Design a protein around this ligand. Structure first.
Ligand SMILES: Nc1ncnc2c1ncn2[C@@H]1O[C@H](COP(=O)(O)OP(=O)(O)CP(=O)(O)O)[C@@H](O)[C@H]1O
Ligand SMILES: Nc1ncnc2c1ncn2[C@@H]1O[C@H](COP(=O)(O)OP(=O)(O)CP(=O)(O)O)[C@@H](O)[C@H]1O
Ligand SMILES: [Mg+2]
Ligand SMILES: [Mg+2]
Ligand SMILES: [Mg+2]
Ligand SMILES: [Mg+2]
Lengths: 284, 282
């Protein structure tokens, strides 16, 4: 693959460590932060598994390239560098000490670890909306939004991650039977499968399920409902029930994200504004 | 999903158990053996994960359909039934108490040690299964120790038909063909030419042989997937395993012949392995 100095990082400056969670591992990167040339830094490294397929490699490359183009943002996991020459491809990204959001929330469920306050949940949701709002402004569709794909930092900052299925808005083959076949069904917008398209509004549908996972503290969507029976139920108007401790207002937000008609759903900008209000009013 | 009465099995007679294109769990099936209507049989059931994708569903469906087509053979995991109506798809297959071959072998490393004859016997059984598979015009495409199951009586059983296809159902020369086959068990032509024939499967059999004789070793140790095909193109081949005779290693090299038609057929492999096994036994 093409050499790209600006992002290349020395293999001898990286010490691979313990497994995290193809295959992702923790590691120390000496001087990865150019202003601290000798300072070792704890990072995360994504690389291929030993039994990886060709598609796994093209996916890893795609993920790296997408992260390069997206740019930097508070709520998006950051690319730190990559080892792409004379050796196995290593994609180095910022290390999130708290793990993924799904595991994070479940570990903080009431004893029935520090519990999540209603404000923490709204704040978590608001941060992600901002992240998605930015992504959309960069013409990027994630396509795989879910609690298991969000990382939490030491200071509880939410980071959208796993861009292994992400695409530039124009890099989607509309109407082909093979388009969107690798998207987890339970987080997927109906038009993704039915019409074989994908827009930012398809991402808002996913965001809706993410909201539900957040307010159920890491629950599994459509419990008891098999994936092969889901789209039938969705066509019939079925939608997940309101999470226990969730305001009717936040629930209507989820419901709005699940409008059958894409343009009928809120834009991420609208979600940010609404959530900003709710968060603020909760604070006061 | 079209109803196929012949294979349909009642859901109320199936009790899912502990965990083992999906996820496999142990289960108890009452009357799966039609001659013993009230008997509970321990089986294995493959189903979709909660986060399954559309492709995960079509693969499981394809897996089921491929197993129905293939027919029965002692060295191929057998289909017992399937719950396809009004509910999640369940593919019910025979339970293999010893797990997959790779785990089985790594456990028997110098937990009852494997003898040279056992290893050959193991290899011979798999060749027999592949010979039958090839005769049914089926290409497995994902042959490897991790895809071989071992029954209570140490019978080898080729499994995981999640990538298998009929020999004529291949999108020839398309750049997207064979994109989901583990690279280290994959025949060179499968990637360079985008084709897949029974001879591609024999190449994988070779790797499988190497895993067997190294007692579950990982192929091309120390070589990343990204670097393997250039090496393979240059002639690189894995070295002989210690607990392996030059003859058996030569069989591996034959399976890895660069030219597809120059690799032996499964029919020829079975004949040679039988001869070798017969000698090792007598
Ligand atoms: N930067 C990071 N810091 C901390 N943990 C990380 C991390 N990147 C990944 N992980 C951990 O590894 C898990 C899997 O990561 P990721 O979502 O990137 O998976 P993956 O693309 O390798 C496979 P899949 O698509 O099956 O998830 C995360 O849910 C998280 O627990
Ligand atoms: N019939 C059976 N009896 C016993 N164990 C079984 C079994 N079927 C599957 N298993 C166990 O589950 C493992 C995975 O099986 P299988 O190879 O079918 O996986 P899979 O198709 O679900 C996913 P992948 O393609 O990622 O392996 C096997 O290696 C074995 O340990
Ligand atoms: Mg992920
Ligand atoms: Mg991924
Ligand atoms: Mg398998
Ligand atoms: Mg499989």
């Amino acid at each position: 693959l093409p050499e790209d100095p600006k992002w290349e990082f020395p293999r001898d400056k990286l010490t691979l460590g313990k497994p995290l969670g193809g295959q992702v591992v923790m590691a120390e990167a000496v001087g990865i932060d150019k202003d601290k040339p000798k300072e070792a830094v704890t990072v995360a490294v994504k690389m291929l598994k030993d039994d990886a397929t060709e598609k796994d490699l093209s996916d890893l490359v795609s993920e790296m390239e997408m992260m390069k183009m997206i740019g930097k943002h508070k709520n998006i996991i950051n690319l730190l560098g990559a080892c792409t020459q004379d050796g196995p491809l290593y994609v180095i990204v910022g290390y999130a000490s708290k793990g993924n959001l799904r595991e994070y929330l479940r570990a903080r469920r009431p004893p029935g670890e520090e519990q999540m306050t209603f404000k923490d949940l709204v704040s978590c949701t608001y941060q992600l909306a901002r992240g998605m709002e930015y992504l959309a402004s960069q013409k990027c569709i994630h396509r795989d939004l879910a609690a298991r794909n969000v990382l939490v930092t030491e200071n509880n900052v939410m980071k959208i991650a796993d861009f292994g299925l992400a695409r530039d808005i124009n890099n989607i083959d509309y109407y082909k039977k093979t388009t969107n076949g690798r998207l987890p069904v339970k987080w997927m917008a109906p038009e993704a499968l039915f019409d074989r398209v994908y827009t930012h509004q398809s991402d808002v549908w996913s965001f809706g399920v993410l909201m539900w996972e957040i307010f159920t503290l890491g629950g599994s969507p459509y419990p008891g409902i098999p994936v092969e029976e889901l789209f039938k139920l969705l066509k019939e108007g079925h939608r997940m029930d309101k999470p226990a401790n969730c305001t009717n207002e936040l629930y209507m937000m989820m419901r709005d994200c699940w409008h059958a008609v894409p343009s009928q759903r809120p834009t991420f900008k609208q979600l940010v504004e609404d959530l900003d209000r709710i968060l603020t009013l909760t604070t006061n």
